[PDB]
Ligand binder design. Structure first.
Ligand SMILES: Nc1ccc2ccccc2n1
Ligand SMILES: [Mg+2]
Ligand SMILES: [Mg+2]
Lengths: 834, 100, 200, 334
RNA sequence: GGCCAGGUAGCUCAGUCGGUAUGAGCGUCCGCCUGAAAAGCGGAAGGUCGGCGGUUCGAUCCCGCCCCUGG
């Protein structure tokens, strides 16, 4: 879309007009183009060939019958008195055609040495070469046929083809549309090398043709954005004429195939000057030519014979009968030039770049004319390109240039296409670059690119040329001076940054969380934001589940995965399947990333004027139109949690390991969490816990549902955990511990509760009743023997009592233990073990 | 399934009607299996809802409690404050010369 | 993502970048293609001067192969102050490259285009322990903040100037360590993360 | 430039040890009264070469610390004596180690900057002050609970603390049996990075524990962080999309052969096809032989460009068995 | 946008233009074996042949539409 192919010989020729004898190596030229801001994607030299590679003429053709494909035994005239007998499998040539022959002893590109062979019962004293075999073009179907008059038989093939040339593959930035021609690139090289430049579109190089009257009646609708529309006819062209070899070759090296002279002229002038041209068969035009917007439901058939559904924003060229062209994109098949065309009407127009860009993108037609118009084409060279086309086409096709010319330039007619002048201080490029440029550097460089510079004290007044509409502000003028002087002259100075505050509390908490999980045996992954296809259906979620309210992507990489992630688990479970399915069956993955949870249907905010700062009310409006993106931490586990070794066979992953991951994230976040049983897919309803920080729910953890594991192809007993980090308040506790120098009292309490009673609820009740004397409590026994009734369990806690100012007695600790036993009896129905 | 592959050895004029009998038997056993799969799956899903309940509050940390010293933590926080302002951390020996 | 960063409407400077748009069509909501919208968000909220970096996920419609990934991470740089110049941008890029490629890291800036910078440039690097031979490889884009961007945030371009840069973390990790397949950097196989150690 | 590589490493060592169940303490530089006499060190022990304080707070404790262990063991005694019997402490601080008698340097004119020769002469007159990391353990390593009765502290826990420090320092370490007081000669390991000795670890001597009043089975660690070089490795792994081949091999060696030496010999012989090797069985008995042991290793083979046959993996396994035969005298179990 | 070639077991891949993919290598499982393993020998399991429809008594195979990859 932004490519620019051109051979160095053509580029050197245009530069050499103003700088005679200018010549550089392809390596140096690539460095210069890069130094001024032209990305060189490729540098491909032609050939190389060695030995006898000569131009020949097919004087006879014998069809060798009795094979798979048509095999031809050809008598080729290579310039001497002995015709060579060549065997060839191509069928794209006839008797009398000029071809390129590689004789025995030649070496084609690729190290292929040519010699005589015994092919198809006959001898092959060489071969007829194709464009691909000579490293000239991409054509490999048939052999290369030079146009008649390209050379005489016996001429050096490398010279006629110009195989010492080098084609340059450029990637032009969208701000330098003027560089999509030999004219612009040569002008850039003249600036970089401080050369005198002769504009190939100037009136000296393209002298104006006579203007004796209108060429064709034309009506232009001005609100279509057209800035110029010129027409000039060329009558009596020879239908049998073809373009010379130098023209067809330069088109080939630029990536354009030659068809007929009329079209070859327009494509050649487009490459030379940057102004797209089109040739209409004037004998097929019926009545007044009209430039207007397309109507609703209107269609048109282009050069390729494809019907195009047009939009009311598309600009058209029409006559009384049909549409003639999709403005700035492609002409129509009604006025196209074919074999019997004798009178042509050349069209030189300047279209609105936005209108062409919209139309070409809707119709998917990025033609050579479209990509140039959408990047603005110089409107001051329209007649010059028109006259260059007429004179060159009449010269090749043996026609006559009509002295008529229609040139619509707007209402009123515009005779000055200069952008508005720009005022800028003479030292502004020096301040932005931090470089003291020599006296007059700014004014010198700005005149080089073609601008008019006047001096008003210390302030310059710069009027950019018509082919540089990208120069609208002093910053644009600064880039011109800086890039031509070379960015390498800018020194390296560290900025005066002020004292910062460093990482935030949330940024530091994430570091601690990832460090703790990795140190605890977890492996970090990067979760993809695109959800898997139908994952929530595999999870068995309700149709109104909050996780299903997703944001969709219009153009995803995979059409079956457009929705964004409302939870980090599907991405982690997908990475877990990858590891398990490749030999790593004992895995523990974790991820820290944001999720996308819309709060409403997707709504957009209109364009706010950029010319000013948006007020805080509109900022709050743009933020409210965005889905909530909270920070989440999640992890999944499968297989062995503890690896096997000399100690034992290892421990498989269980739900308690997911709960331990919660306690690790809690400890890394300096908060206290409580775990309460909950039912929440895709977890096992009997092995699932809802995590709470105080009274706020922050996530879930435990073992996944066995049906979800089956439907998702996960390993058996896979556990998961997910927490909302933004739901956890950032805490910075300042503890003030006072160590007691007095001994402690150790006691164990055994309580019998129902099986459904959580063990933490028993410890919370024992702690609440014991009082301040309780220093530490730890559960170390859960007994469910036959002495304990059914659906009941015995829990034994290790209590440690210590006073801050005295030594306790056993009755002192037993008093707090009894009060703790009474509290457990009231809160969890505990019974002292008997 | 062995009756399905035995149709390839049958004469062409017989595979039509003999095959029609095979699919009818094939769909008969398949339709009975599909419903039984759903009923047994529904029973499994209903079993985990009323049983298999664990105490999610049981202690899970088998690693003892560890802690860095608060003085080292304060020095760490003081260092991060000055690094964020561009300063660096210098060092010096505890046993010092009287010259220094 | 586009309008506040001087992206022209209906122009190849905006249409060339194929972006993930949020359904329905013409919703003006999209997945970010660069960490550059954080420039706008920072300039409206914070008081001048501003010296911030931003690290986050960015989304492009590129197919995942050995050297490209549709979802990658980028580090954004924004410095807005009184009297900032290209030399201050060059000084920041040199210090950044010296910390991630060693003391033998010397950079090279060449002109380029970005809708939000004028002048714009691309940064190349060169360190001594080059995995693929000592040569110039592309690192990221940079340049001075366009005055239109400063006007769209309420900053006077006559008093305040600023520069910027943006480099991909996924691209930086490749040629620094010599990683062969970028797919292994994102696919999440433990065989890729484990050789790097625990990390802290 | 932020933190130096060493300073960053010291934070990682402190974080990793704390997350693994260790509690940081601040060690006092003044040695307990006759601690080395309680350790039973020889009179020519390099640790006995201490720098003495002229005016100490305690007249019986005037020597400065050549090792961090006496201060950590003293803090370990305080915790156990106050009801905290299951305790794991650690400390990161510098020690002092003179290479000669305390030599002073005369006054240098303050009216000017001393030259670099005078600065180097002032630094040479000071004792060597390298930074050490050390840890002590006693009682239960794993606390009891609903899972089981817990595991007491053993020498392998001290060796694991070394590996925790090594993983934090991004370096590889090798353990070799050594006799070095106050460690138990049969439960002591000398830590090496490359070819540089960096410290010792393991269970303490029973006589040292008895004379110092320490808990039975006390284990300790001490490393010289200045002896460990800083490293910033740049790995570039390539994940092979081809399936792996699992194989196990049992090898019989002498009892004194360390299991790591057999694993290294298997790695050296298996070649680049070996992706992972893990030891999961140590067996002894009359089927094996006296003063011998059988070690079984789980091997994982994988090629980066092809699927392997079982003969492909068995060839690399046989080359590993042959490498262990030449290196540690291993015999394939039959 | 073109006519094509591809999507096949857990991994990497053969193979079929109507009734069995007598699928391979590695992966999983069983037996002999070992204190417990692995190899070896001897054996099983596992694919709804990319998805949705259609044609057909019956579709990996024939038709249509769609998803994903290379030219
Ligand atoms: N994210 C990003 C990419 C390219 C930039 C170019 C110039 C300034 C800032 C940029 N940011
Ligand atoms: Mg510019
Ligand atoms: Mg496959």
């Amino acid at each position: 879309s932004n490519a620019m192919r051109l051979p160095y010989s053509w580029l050197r020729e245009v530069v050499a007009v103003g700088a005679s004898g200018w010549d550089v190596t392809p390596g140096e030229l690539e460095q210069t183009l890069l130094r001024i801001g032209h990305e060189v994607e490729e540098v491909i030299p032609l050939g190389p060939v060695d030995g006898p590679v000569t131009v020949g003429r097919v004087a006879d053709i014998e069809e060798l019958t009795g094979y798979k494909k048509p095999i031809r035994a050809c008598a080729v005239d290579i310039g001497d008195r002995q015709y060579r007998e060549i065997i060839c499998g191509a069928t794209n040539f006839a008797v009398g055609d000029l071809v390129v022959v590689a004789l025995p002893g030649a070496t084609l590109p690729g190290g292929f040495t040519i010699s005589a062979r015994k092919a198809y019962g006959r001898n092959s004293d060489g071969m007829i070469c194709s464009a691909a075999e000579l490293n000239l073009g991409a054509d490999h179907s048939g052999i290369l046929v030079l146009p008649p008059g390209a050379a005489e038989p016996g001429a050096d093939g490398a010279g006629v083809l110009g195989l010492d040339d080098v084609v340059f593959h450029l990637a032009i930035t969208p701000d330098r549309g003027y560089c999509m021609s030999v004219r612009g690139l040569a002008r850039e090289l003249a600036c970089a090398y401080d050369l005198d430049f002769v504009d190939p579109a100037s009136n000296s190089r393209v002298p104006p043709l006579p203007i004796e009257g209108p060429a064709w009646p034309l009506t232009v609708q001005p609100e279509t954005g057209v800035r110029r529309f010129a027409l000039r006819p060329v009558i009596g062209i020879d239908p049998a004429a073809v373009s010379p070899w130098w023209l067809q070759r330069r088109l080939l090296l630029c990536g354009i195939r030659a068809t007929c002279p009329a079209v070859d002229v327009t494509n050649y002038v487009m490459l030379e000057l940057g102004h797209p041209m089109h040739a209409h068969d004037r004998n097929r035009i019926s009545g007044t030519l009209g430039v207007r917007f397309a109507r609703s439901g209107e269609t048109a058939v282009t050069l390729d014979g494809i019907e195009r559904k047009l939009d009311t924003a598309d600009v058209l060229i029409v006559d009384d009968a049909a549409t003639a062209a999709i403005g700035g994109v492609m002409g129509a098949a009604s006025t196209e030039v074919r074999a019997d065309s004798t009178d042509v009407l050349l069209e030189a127009a300047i279209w609105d770049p936005a209108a062409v860009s919209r139309t070409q993108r809707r119709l998917h037609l990025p033609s050579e004319a479209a990509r140039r118009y959408e990047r603005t084409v110089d409107p001051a060279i329209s007649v010059a390109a028109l006259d260059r086309c007429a004179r060159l086409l009449a010269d090749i096709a043996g026609g006559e240039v009509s002295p008529t010319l229609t040139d619509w330039r707007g209402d009123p007619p515009c005779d000055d296409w200069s952008p508005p002048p720009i005022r800028m201080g003479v030292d502004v490029p020096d301040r932005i670059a931090g470089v003291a440029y020599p006296q007059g550097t700014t004014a010198r460089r700005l005149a080089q690119i073609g601008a008019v510079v006047t001096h008003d004290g210390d302030t310059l007044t710069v009027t950019p040329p018509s082919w540089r509409p990208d120069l609208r502000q002093p910053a644009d003028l600064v880039e011109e001076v800086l890039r031509l002087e070379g960015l390498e002259v800018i020194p390296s100075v560290l900025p005066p940054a002020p004292a910062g505050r460093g990482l935030t509390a949330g940024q530091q908490r994430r570091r601690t969380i990832g460090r703790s999980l990795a140190l605890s045996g977890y492996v970090e992954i990067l979760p993809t934001p695109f959800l898997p296809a139908g994952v929530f259906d595999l999870w068995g979620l309700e149709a109104d589940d909050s996780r299903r309210m997703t944001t969709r992507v219009l153009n995803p990489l995979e059409a079956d995965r457009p929705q964004l992630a409302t939870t980090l688990l599907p991405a982690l479970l997908e990475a877990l399947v990858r590891n398990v399915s490749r030999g790593l069956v004992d895995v523990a993955l974790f991820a820290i990333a944001q999720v996308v949870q819309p709060t409403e249907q997707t709504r957009g905010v209109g364009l706010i004027p950029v010319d000013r700062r948006p007020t805080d009310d509109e900022i709050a409006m743009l933020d409210a139109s965005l889905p909530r993106q909270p920070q989440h931490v999640a992890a999944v586990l499968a297989g062995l949690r503890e690896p096997r070794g000399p100690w034992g066979p290892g421990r498989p992953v269980e739900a308690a390991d997911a709960f331990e991951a919660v306690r690790i994230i809690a400890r890394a976040s300096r908060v206290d969490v409580t775990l309460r049983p909950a039912q929440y897919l895709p977890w096992h309803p009997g092995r699932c816990a809802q995590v709470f920080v105080g009274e706020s729910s922050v996530g879930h953890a435990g073992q996944l549902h066995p049906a979800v594991i089956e439907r998702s192809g996960l390993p058996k007993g896979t556990c998961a955990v997910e927490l909302n980090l933004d739901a956890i308040p950032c805490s910075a506790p300042l503890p003030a511990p006072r160590v007691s120098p007095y001994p402690a009292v150790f006691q164990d309490v055994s309580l019998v509760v129902a099986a459904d009673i959580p063990a933490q609820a028993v410890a919370d009740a024992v702690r609440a009743g014991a009082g301040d004397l309780l220093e530490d409590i730890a559960l170390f026994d859960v007994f469910t023997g036959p002495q304990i009734g059914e659906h009941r369990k015995s829990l034994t806690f290790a209590l440690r009592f210590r006073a801050p100012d005295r030594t306790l007695t056993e009755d002192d600790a037993s008093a707090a233990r009894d009060a703790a036993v009474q509290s457990a009896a009231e809160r969890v129905g505990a019974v002292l073990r008997g | 399934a062995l009756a399905r592959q035995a149709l390839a050895v049958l004469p062409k004029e017989q595979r039509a009607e003999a095959g029609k009998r095979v699919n009818a038997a094939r769909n008969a056993a398949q339709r009975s299996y599909d419903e039984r799969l759903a009923t047994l799956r529904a029973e499994r899903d209903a079993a985990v809802l009323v049983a298999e309940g664990i105490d999610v509050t049981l202690p899970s940390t088998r690693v003892p409690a560890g802690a860095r010293h608060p003085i080292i933590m304060l020095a760490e926080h003081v260092a991060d404050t000055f690094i964020a302002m561009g300063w660096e951390l210098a060092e010096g020996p505890e046993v010092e010369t009287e010259q220094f | 993502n586009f309008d506040a960063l001087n992206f022209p409407a209906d122009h190849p400077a905006r249409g060339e970048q194929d972006t993930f748009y949020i359904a329905p069509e013409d919703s003006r909501q999209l997945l970010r293609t660069h960490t550059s919208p954080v420039q706008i968000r920072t300039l409206l909220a914070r008081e001048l001067p501003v010296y911030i970096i931003s690290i986050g996920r960015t989304f492009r419609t590129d197919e995942l192969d050995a050297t490209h990934t549709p979802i990658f991470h980028q580090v954004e740089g924004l410095a807005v102050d009184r009297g900032l110049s290209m030399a201050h941008l060059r000084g920041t890029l040199d210090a950044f490259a010296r910390a991630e490629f060693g003391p033998s890291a010397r950079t090279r800036i060449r002109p380029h285009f970005f809708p939000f910078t004028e002048p714009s440039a691309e940064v190349d690097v060169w360190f001594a322990n080059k995995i693929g031979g000592a040569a110039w490889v592309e690192w990221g884009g940079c340049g001075m903040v366009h005055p239109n961007v400063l006007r769209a945030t309420g900053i006077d371009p006559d008093l305040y100037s600023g520069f910027a840069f943006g480099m991909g973390l996924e691209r930086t990790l490749q040629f620094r360590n010599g990683i062969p397949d970028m797919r292994d950097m994102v696919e999440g196989d433990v065989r890729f993360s484990l050789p790097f150690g625990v990390g802290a």
